[PDB]
Amino acid sequence: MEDFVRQCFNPMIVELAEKAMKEYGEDPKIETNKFAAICTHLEVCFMYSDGGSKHRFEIIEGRDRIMAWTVVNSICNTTGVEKPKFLPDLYDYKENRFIEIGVTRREVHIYYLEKANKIKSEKTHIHIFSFTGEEMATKADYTLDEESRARIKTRLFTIRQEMASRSLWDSFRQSERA
Ligand SMILES: O=C(NCCc1ccccc1)c1nc([C@@H]2CCCN2C(=O)c2c(F)cccc2F)[nH]c(=O)c1O
Ligand SMILES: [Mg+2]
Numbered sequence: 001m002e003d004f005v006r007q008c009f010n011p012m013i014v015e016l017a018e019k020a021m022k023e024y025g026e027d028p029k030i031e032t033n034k035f036a037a038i039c040t041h042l043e044v045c046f047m048y049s050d051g052g053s054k055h056r057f058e059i060i061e062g063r064d065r066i067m068a069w070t071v072v073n074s075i076c077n078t079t080g081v082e083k084p085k086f087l088p089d090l091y092d093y094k095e096n097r098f099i100e101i102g103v104t105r106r107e108v109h110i111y112y113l114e115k116a117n118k119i120k121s122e123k124t125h126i127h128i129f130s131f132t133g134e135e136m137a138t139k140a141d142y143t144l145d146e147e148s149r150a151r152i153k154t155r156l157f158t159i160r161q162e163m164a165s166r167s168l169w170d171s172f173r174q175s176e177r178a
């Protein structure tokens, strides 16, 4: 799985994921399913931000904490939207709302509820993807067009099929905890 991750994800993504794990005392060479999941969520966030017009989204995920909050507080001051309690993943300039992106090995409805319970921001939009083509978003408002979402869902399916061909999928799919 460590070899899978290093060959299927961009080195910038891999470096950010290693750093995120090491900041919590986790070793990417040992907790390899977590390593893979962090990389996958990063790639989905970056794909999502590419899915609209140029300048539609600001990326918050993948930044160090100081810069991430600088972006969030700057947007709140400039647009007046409510400041979130936790860092979200994107800001949507067209809809004027923060977005929390989730990628789940379980089922999108469970994960959506967990994310809504945790962030409890009311104003933050939640958009969930699975590895088997399901998605679930706040108010069935999926933000992007069907073509962009299909490209994300196809990428996740491709990751799943690649892990399975290496007998990695069974362990990864059962590694997500509530
Ligand atoms: O922004 C996020 N975490 C930053 C703040 C953060 C850091 C640590 C714990 C909670 C929040 C974020 N985290 C997740 C999942 C679930 C929560 C942890 N986690 C990680 O990936 C992760 C990680 F962050 C650090 C170390 C190891 C990890 F496994 N899922 C998202 O969808 C998402 O946006
Ligand atoms: Mg995040």
Ligand SMILES: [Mn+2]
Binding pocket: 041, 089, 100, 101, 102
């Ligand atoms: Mn997220």
